[PDB]
Structures are given as C-alpha cells and as structure tokens.
Design a protein around this ligand. Structure first.
Ligand SMILES: CCCCCCCCCCCCC/C=C\[C@H](O)[C@H](N)CO
Ligand SMILES: CCCCCCCCCCCCC/C=C\[C@H](O)[C@H](N)CO
Lengths: 193, 245, 296, 245, 296, 49
C-alpha cells in the first residue's frame, strides 16, 4: 500500500503536502458528496502518486482486482458514518446518494478500528485492459468511486470541528501485467552533466 | 464480539462497531414457498443477486420535539431498481426483509428510540374530533411512499392502541449511551402464499423517541436517522404489462 | 448444472429454520434451594434491554429461596378455554309499525365487530381460524313468549337475497334453512371454516381493487373480501302480517381455535364497525392517575 | 411430421402447419459461460422465465417493388419488458436467440424470400456517389431500433458485398409455394465471454425478396411479414444505475 | 435445494452440444460402382432447398459410374497453406526535400487494410488469430543501395512517440529496437498475438464510447480498440541530415493461423482504410455480361 | 496503524463466482524486466573541435 493523492487540487510549493489528505466536517444532514475519483491505475490522476501506478506505467496491459483503504485521523470523541460506492463502467457520475447506492458499496462506521477497506472487483468484458485515455481508448474505463455522507459528523463541546482522511491503495493477489514498454515520462530536460 | 458486526448480501456491505445483537423475528428465517403451500401453476422467477441487496431510502432529522415516523413495506421499494421493476411487472409477490437503522451521536448526548415492526398496521382517523364523521385517511397517509410519514398522536399509535405494549412485536432500542444501530430480520408474514405488491402492505416500521434528545449548547445539533433495508428470498410470478398505479 | 454457482446455491430451500421449539408444561415451574454468593464475573442482575429480549434473571439468583413444589395447572389459559364462551354478536328487530323492518323480514350481514366485549377479545390477534356455533334467542320486546313460526335462511355470497316476505327465494331448495317456533328452546347449529384464505384476518392493510385510489373511493380501504361470509335472513312464515312484535338475538361460540401474531389491545372507545377510528378531541390515558409520583 | 411444429419457451407458444425444419446455426446450441472462459468475479443473474420468451416487434408489408429490410440484435429488445430493463440496468450481457419469421398467402400467389443472419453486419455509405467524401452512416441507419430499416442497394447488401454469397450464413427460404415460416437458432457469437448490450450488436437479420411477389387482380393485395424472437440462456452482470442512451 | 423446479432445472449447463464432428480426410473421396435403378419411393434427385441445407445427391445416384481410386491430396487448401505467404502491407518514404517526412523520421500505424490484395484475403473471415513475421526492405527511390544506418523502434500503445530525429525517446531502454544497414540483407523478426481479446476482428458493429452518438462523433463507428497494436517508427541514426533519400517497404507473413465465421468476399473497389464505403454512382456487377441468355 | 497491508479479499466483501485464473506472472521477473539493452554512453571524435 502507498498513499493515494485524491486531493490533487493544490500546486504551490508550500501547499504540496496538502494533497495527501481530504477533510471531513459537520453538514446539514442531506447526504452530501465528499470526493470523487477514477479507478484506472495507469491513467493520469490520483493513482500516479502510488507505487502501483508507477510500476504499471511500464506495462501496456493489466488485469485483476484493486484495494483502497481509508484511515480516519480525527479525535477520539468524533463519530460518523460514510458511504463509499463504486460505479461499474457505462454509468454517469451519480447525481445523488440514491443513485450511488445502486452499485457495489460499503458503509463505514468510525470507532476503535480507524480504517476500512473498499475492494474494486474485476468487472470487464475482455480478459485484459489497455491503458485508457480520452478518445477511442476510453473503451477501457474501470468506473468511478464516490464518497457520500451517511448520517453526519458529530462532535462534542471542546473538540475540533474538522478532521482528515488518508487514502491508501494497492492490488490483490490476482493482479498481473504483460507487454512491457517504456514509461511515458522521462526525467531529463537536457544533458545530465 | 457481540458489539462489532458485518452484514453482506448481494454486492453491498454494512460495518458497525456498536451493536446489540441481531433479532430474528418470531424465531424464523426467510425461505421459499414449498410445493404443498403453493397454488399457482406457472413457475416463479428468482432473480437473486439483483434484488436481494441493501437499499437506503432517506435521512430524517431528530429534534428535541420529534414525535415519530412510520414506513410501509414493500411500498417503499416499489420504485427503486430491479426490485421495483419486477414488482410492477408481475402480479404475485413474496419475500422476507432485513432492516438496519442507523443513528450516531457523541458521548455527551442522550436519548432513546423504539424501533418496532407491526404486521397489518392499519391507520385510523380522528373521526372529525367528535366521533361523528365517518372519514377515512387519504392515500398519502396510508401509503406514504419512500419518504415516510410523521405520527400525529404517537400515544395511540394513530390507530387507537397503546404504545406501551408495542414491545410485543419484534423490536430493538437505540440508546445513545449504549449502541447506535438496530437490526431486525422478518420472514414472510401473510395468510396467503403469494400476494400483490401494489395493493397490500405486509407490515410497517415505527421509529418513536421515547426519551427525548438532549445536549448542551456548543455540541453538534444535527442528529440524522437513516434507514437501510434488503429483501431476502424474493419470488415473482404472473408476468404481464408494467403497471405503476 | 455445471457452473459451481448453481451447485452450491441455496435457492429453493423451502424448509423453515426454527430457533425455538415447544416443550410440555402442564404446571408451573418449581423453585429450588439457593444460598449466598460472593463472586466476581457473574452478574445475573445486570441486564441489557437494548437487545430486545426479556430479562433472564430468576428467583434463585437474586435472593435465598426454599424448595417449593408447584402443582398449579395451566389449563385455563389455553385458546379453547379462553374463547369457547358464547357472547352476543348481533340483534334483529321486527316491529309492527316502524321504519326499520316494518314488512316482516330482515337481513343481517354476518360480522363480529358490532359489540365491543367480543370485538376486543378477538382483536388481540391478527389471524384466527375456528369453527362456530350460533344460537338464536327469540322473544317479544317485553320478553313474553308467544305462538309464532319463524324461518332463518343462510345466504352465501352471490346468492339472491329476499326482497319481501313472499319472495320466491324462500323456497330454500339449496340454501340451508331452519323452521322454529317461539315456544321451542332456542335453535342452534354448527358452522365450518369457510374463508378462501387459511385464516380470518381482522386487520387488512390495503385496498381490494386495482387502479387509482382517490378520495371518493376511500371507503374501500381496509376491506377484506375474504371475511364477507354472506347474509343471515329472517321472516315470519305467512302471507298476512303477524300479530306480535319480535326481537332476535344471536350468540356465537368458537371451537377448534388457532391464532397468530398478537398485537396491543384496544385503548380507546369504538366508533364504527371495521374501522379503527377514534375520537380525536377526547384521548384518554390507558389507566387512572394520581397527584404526585412520590406519594400513593 | 416435418411440416407441423410447435415451439414452447417461457409462457408463449407458436404453432405452424407449413414448415421446412429448424436450422441450428453453426451446429451449436446456446449455453452458459464456463468457469474457464469467465473473467469477471461477481456472480451473474439468470432471471430465466421472465426474459426467455417470444417477442413480436412489428408488421411490414410486402409489395411488388420491395427491396428488403434488416434488423439489429439485441438492439431491438433493449426497450421491451424485463429483458430491456435488465439490459439497461447491467453492464455485461450474453444470450442466444431463436428467430421465427411468418408470411402467409394463398395457393395463387407466388414469391420467395431469403432470411439470413450475418454476424457483425457493418453498414457503409455511398461515399457521396464519387468515392471522394469520407462520410459515415447516421445513428439511425446503424441501429434502427425495433422498426428496422429498408435497404437502398440490396445487390451489394449496403456494405459492398454480393448478395449471391449470403447463403454461406445460417439461412432459410420462404417460398410461398412450399412453406410460410422460417426458424433459425443462433448461439452466442463473439470473441469475448461478455459484452455490452448498448454499444455492441452481435449480428443482423436480413429479409430480401429474391423473386418478386405476383398475383392476379381480385386476390388479397396485402401480404404482411411479422418477426418473432426469443432470447435463450440470458446472463447479466455488473449492476449499476439505469442508463438508456 | 428442495422445490422440484430447481432440482430439474437445466440452468448452469456450460457444455456445448455439437451436432457435428470432424473426421480425417487426407484425400478426395472415391467413387464406387453403380448400376441402373427402377423403383418407386426413392428419389435422390428431388430436393427441397427451402430447408436451408445443401443437396445430398451423389454421383452414384444419378448416373452409372465405375470404381475410381482418388489419391489427390487436400493439403494445399489449409489455412496455413493459404496464409503463410508474405505480402506488402505498408510503405514509408523519407525524402530530402518534401512535405511528408522532411525531418528524417516517420511514424506508421500498424494496419493491414492499406493494400487490397491482402485485405481481400483477410476479410473472408470475421475473427482471426495468428503470429506474424515482418520483413523490412530498404533502398533509394531508384533502387540503389547506399551506406546508411537506420533504426526501427516498436512503440506499444500508451508509450511516448518520438517527435524529432534527436528525441529522448530513441534511448529505447524498454521498447525493442533494431539497428541495421542498407548493405545488409533485409531485417526480419517475429511477432506474437497481442490482442486483449481472443482474436482479431476486422468488422466491429458498434461504438467504442458510451453516451449519445451524434453526427460529429460518427468517425468512431466501427472502430475496435482491440486491433490498435501500436506504432512503428523509423529514423536515420545521426545528428545532421542524411545524404540520400530512402524508401522502406514492409512485408508480413502469418503463421499458426486460426479463423472463424466466413462471410462473402468483397465485390466493389476499396476507398478508405477501416471503412466499408463504396462508390454509389458506379456499382458494377460481380462478373461479366453477355447479350442474350439463350446464346453464348 | 500497525504498518501492514489489508488482508481483506474479494470473497469477504461481495458475492463472487468461481473463476479459474490462468494468467502468467513470468513477465514481471527481474530478468524479464532488465534484460533489454539501452543507451548508457556516447563518445564523439571530431576532426576539428
Ligand atoms: C339457519 C342458519 C343461519 C346461519 C347463521 C350464519 C352462519 C354463517 C357464519 C359464517 C362464519 C362466521 C364468522 C364470520 C366471519 C368473521 O367472523 C366476520 N366477518 C368478522 O367481521
Ligand atoms: C523493430 C520492430 C518493429 C515491429 C514492427 C511492428 C510489429 C507490431 C505488429 C503488431 C501485430 C500485427 C497485427 C496487427 C493487428 C491487425 O493486424 C491490424 N490492426 C488490422 O488493421
């Protein structure tokens, strides 16, 4: 497992360390949305910060199940529940929680165990997937992952109103790759003297 | 051991770390209809994983002055997904259910809820206030849909029966001091092997705050309540056109 | 069946798994000798009512007891011992001059919800299955017995109901009928279980017809066709009008009783038959009241 | 014996008294996917009797100057009943098919039809008439729906290939002198175990009058053609929201 | 499984029932002795083509024949005997002054549909699975051989394509590459089956992307991503511009060939790659014509 | 917080089917990853320079 940069919004040098976690706080109770990201390890985005993405960058095709783990780093007095849903390919970005509940999902309750795991099972028509990108090659999308509020973020008097979540990603035991190639990015701008 | 639990059915999962065991209603598990009980001749359909999975309906806010709410089954799920499509395409219906109610707070909040299941929960009216007018409740009150309905006279359960005897029905409590969830499993309850899902409601779910919510100013004032349910051992028969009404 | 999802599947299991079973219990349970206990880790007194089950603490766990042999019988609390007692379920009036039944015949729809004493007993359960026994007591408004011939006909649903004292439907070629005098002891017969379902139900949460359920069709809510068993008809056997006014009272006693799914007993006054309606303005508590909780 | 036939699947039945046997395409029957072939991990759903039954699409009139028609599978059934609901609720799809074409006349009418099944029937354009413009057919021509589409150049099959070699595909004839129906059974044909029902079409059905219709004035001039089909061994997997486009 | 609908069910049978089977046949079938027949009820000549099957009549049924032993071999009509012959599939031009590739490098997308002779052969089937063998013949526009160093790089999809003669992508640390002279015999290598599917398909009836399919997205119809195997890149190894113009020709030969589902062969002229488009105004018949059907 | 990876599997979280996996892992070895030639140096020998 390695840290997954779901919150890849900031780009300043001082704010580069803020990409490693995303916040959670008290809401109005409507079942609001927290974050969304794609499930393609080889595509550009959050998965480029993991070791799995870097290693899969050298291979054209892959096959297998993935695993994502979220750890809650709030105070001991905070409670809450969340819904994390995975939408198989072909479905648009869910508009609300009612549509997001129709895919594979898990409900996470904060407590003594601070982490939960979401498994992204292998659902595809072909045995292998090639690397997907905008255009014709979006034939190989894996789907989307969304995080919704289940009930609320409840906290007593005297504890901070905002907490943070760390996401860790890895692969399962059926993961394989083939057809070795070269990495898309070369880290050299001229002559290395 | 009895505090932590996991429920897996279909492609959905629920994890909890504060529980008070699972109630199996009337000491019986859901099952399919036998040949001796069955009456229709056509073979039923059993879509399995596409209909037996957890559904979440809506979120309701708990206030210091709340009365209570109630839902009707299977009226909530007649418009949701493959279960709704199957229910409105066929004539006959049968299934069990699994009900999970969630409500969490802090260690400085207090309160209590009663979650009960009452078969054939018929709703009465106030008869104009004097007992002279023979009125009947509108369709909105009898089958409120997936949004539920709020009780007006929780003491008489809006039907003329005391609430203090509701514990005779399969029930649990949600004490904010002890737990934050309640799980009940209900078999198929009816005097017939099959029935219509658009004309008959098997039972109802009641959530009534017996002990009022309290907290000191400065804590979180929003305490939501969420309902999650999943059909078990669903069967359909009598295929025809699709009717919604 | 080849794929290893169908072989391992549990679909089609029609057997009911029961957590509990019934045991013989003709008398109350005995009490055994108990002594003092001073230990850590055993707490019979401390319970958790949030689970939804009743307390399992006993006499022996809490106090020191003696050996008592209990021989008290539990045979008076069965369903046949509770329900096999006749009670008034209907009443028919046949006056000389009046507006209700002045022509010498009457029709009564079979129902139990007309009187509160038996209605409250029967509405403790949701489903009920039993045989019946109807007894007809006939007399005048003052109680006097007079010489007169009466006829009772049982009309199953779908059969043509009589419309006069001289109707052609009184030939009773198929429907059962009874001819009895007012000087005879009251007539009584036996009735089977006739519901198309497996049990009568006193509460039906739904509508009997398909289509839109509007506000002018609201009198159909809660009406179960499986409980409508027919009509009871009565007339004075003759061509001219009778000489005396008459009153008929019906009593019914259950036997071979089964019941399911208990529910809370009624709390408020009854207003209408086959209707859980109650008076909104005057809601009364279940019991009495006192001035203070710290006194008696 | 070979003239009379009956086809029973689900709750539908077809009876005919003028037939020319049943063609089983490529000498193979429809079947379910094996564990060695399967790739996805989630278990599929098999609704059985609710989706494997006969459907009738529409009626088309045969004139003295007709060219021909074609339909796309399973694009015809993506909006019809439980099969359509399942196909637009899930991501993956697989099934076989059974096709029955009906057309009847009298003993004084004459004509002939060719009914063939062509996998991966890609449609081309006339390239502006001079071969200079690189155009592509609109979505209406590629997937016409349940109404079908009429051929413009039946000699080249609207794709640049001769019609005289279409007999290499599973086919039958409807000769008004001999028979009045054609039945073909097709297994699942694809290079993948599962595929999407909204982006891919497995094959197409062609009805082309090789010998023109003729009759004398005074006889019935309306000669309809009706198409009836039924899925066989249907499987779905990848449950999600319902998408129509 | 208890109900007797699940026990008897045929759901889950994954075995394919095959009506036919393959038999050894190294040579053509023999012909046996036949004599005259005069009988009623046996009609080998009369057939019924409406069934959809071919005629089953033989030589012996129709005429009187002699015994002939056939030893002609059928080994030249197999798929490996039909397809294992190299043919031109691509051509790359590297001129000194021009507009196409004046900078000394070129990129070629791997495809077979560029030339008609091999395209018509491969498009007889729908699915095909094979290994490959590519041979590169290099020379000048006039055919003269000159001393020069060339580099060929195979770029799998997703890898960064070179953008100049001195690009950093020519370090070929991962992608396979070949360095060859123009005085050497032509270079040739072996290629495996790389499709994510189980077979290449030349016809794909559908769209590769989800969503609405409008008229400005019509160039995506029929495009199968499983056939896009990458890019072939070529350059002259140096820093300054070369002295001679060059032309490169690619020939590919299949081996270990399998095929499925035959279809009618192409009839009209080809217009575009990966497009069944044809000229609408000029549709020509499959063959020649004559003046009258009653003459030759 | 222990420092180990998650041990949850496919079968624990969702209902699955029996799948026989025959995909090979022979292309991710070290010899399969490193035995490919690449440019490591360059030497220039000019006439005037
Ligand atoms: C001379 C014979 C007269 C017969 C008198 C009437 C007998 C018919 C009795 C039918 C069965 C009685 C029970 C009826 C059903 C339910 O109890 C009620 N519908 C409840 O409202
Ligand atoms: C120095 C090595 C140069 C390698 C030259 C190219 C090799 C790559 C060949 C890939 C496989 C060839 C077959 C390609 C797929 C289909 O044939 C075509 N897409 C059909 O359009």
């Amino acid at each position: 497992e390695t840290i997954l940069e779901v919150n890849n919004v900031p780009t300043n040098a001082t704010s580069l360390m803020e990409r490693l976690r995303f916040p959670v706080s008290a809401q109005a109770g409507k079942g609001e949305l927290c974050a969304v990201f794609r499930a393609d390890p080889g595509r550009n985005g959050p998965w480029q910060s993991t070791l799995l993405g870097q290693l899969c960058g050298y291979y054209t095709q892959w096959s297998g199940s993935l695993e994502v783990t979220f750890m809650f780093t709030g105070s001991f007095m905070a409670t809450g529940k969340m819904l994390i849903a995975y939408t198989p390919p072909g479905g648009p970005l869910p508009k609300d929680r009612a549509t997001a509940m129709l895919g594979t999902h898990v409900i996470w309750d904060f407590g003594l165990q601070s982490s939960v795991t979401l498994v992204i099972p292998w659902i595809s028509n072909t045995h292998y997937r090639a690397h997907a990108r905008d255009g014709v090659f979006d034939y190989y999308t894996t789907g989307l992952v969304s995080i919704w509020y289940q009930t609320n973020y409840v906290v007593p008097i005297g504890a901070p109103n905002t907490a943070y979540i760390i996401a860790l990603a890895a692969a399962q035991k059926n993961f394989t790759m083939k057809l070795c190639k070269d990495a898309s990015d070369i880290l050299q701008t001229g002559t290395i003297q | 051991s009895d505090r932590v639990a996991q429920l897996t059915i279909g492609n959905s999962t629920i994890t909890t770390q504060e529980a008070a065991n699972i109630i199996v209603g009337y000491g019986e598990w859901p099952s399919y209809c036998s040949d001796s009980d069955a009456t229709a001749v056509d073979k039923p359909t059993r879509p399995d994983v596409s209909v037996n999975r957890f559904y979440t309906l809506d979120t309701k806010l708990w206030e210091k002055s709340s009365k209570g709410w109630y839902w009707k089954f299977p009226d909530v799920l007649t418009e949701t997904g493959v279960f709704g499509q199957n229910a409105q395409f066929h004539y006959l219906y049968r299934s069990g259910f699994c009900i999970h109610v969630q409500c969490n707070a802090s260690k400085f909040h207090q309160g209590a809820l009663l979650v009960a299941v009452l078969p054939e929960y018929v709703i009465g009216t106030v008869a104009g206030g004097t007992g002279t007018e023979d009125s009947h409740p509108p369709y909105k009150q009898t089958q409120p849909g997936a949004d539920g309905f709020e009780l007006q006279h929780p003491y008489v359960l809006d039907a003329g029966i005391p609430i203090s005897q509701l514990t005779v029905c399969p029930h649990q409590w949600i004490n904010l001091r002890t737990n934050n969830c309640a799980t009940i499993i209900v078999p198929y309850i009816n005097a017939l092997p099959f029935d219509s899902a658009l004309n008959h409601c098997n039972f109802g779910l009641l959530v009534v705050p017996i002990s009022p919510l309290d907290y000191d100013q400065g804590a979180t004032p929003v305490i939501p309540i969420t309902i999650t349910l999943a059909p078990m051992c669903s069967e359909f028969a009598g295929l025809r056109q699709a009717v919604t009404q | 069946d080849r794929v290893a999802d169908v072989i391992e599947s549990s679909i089609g299991d029609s057997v009911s798994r029961a957590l509990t079973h019934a045991l013989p219990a003709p008398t109350g349970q005995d009490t055994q000798v108990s002594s003092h206990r001073l230990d850590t880790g055993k707490v019979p007194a401390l319970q958790a009512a949030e689970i939804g089950a009743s307390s399992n603490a006993s006499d022996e766990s809490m106090i020191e007891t003696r050996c008592v042999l209990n021989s008290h019988s539990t045979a008076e609390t069965t369903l046949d011992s509770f329900f096999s007692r006749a009670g008034l379920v209907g009443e028919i009036d046949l006056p000389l001059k009046g507006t209700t039944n002045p022509n010498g015949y009457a029709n009564w729809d079979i129902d139990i919800t007309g009187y509160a004493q038996m209605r409250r007993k029967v509405e403790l359960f949701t489903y009920m299955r039993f045989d019946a026994e109807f007894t007809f007591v006939a007399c005048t408004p003052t109680g006097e017995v007079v010489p007169q011939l009466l006829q009772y006909m049982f009309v199953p649903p779908g059969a043509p109901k009589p419309d006069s004292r001289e109707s052609l439907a009184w030939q009773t070629a198929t429907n059962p009928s009874v001819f009895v005098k007012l000087s005879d002891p009251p007539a009584q017969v036996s009735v089977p279980f006739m519901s198309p379902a497996s049990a009568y139900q006193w509460f039906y949460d739904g509508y009997p017809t398909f289509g839109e359920h509007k506000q002018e069709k609201d009198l159909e809510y809660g009406a179960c066709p499986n409980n409508m068993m027919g009509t009871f008809s009565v007339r004075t056997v003759g061509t001219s009008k009778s000489k005396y006014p008459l009153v008929v009272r019906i009593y019914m006693r259950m036997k071979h009783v089964r019941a399911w799914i208990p529910r809370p007993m009624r709390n408020q006054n009854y207003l209408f038959k086959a209707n859980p309606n109650y008076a909104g303005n005057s809601i009364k508590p279940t019991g009495t009241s006192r001035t203070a909780i710290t006194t008696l």
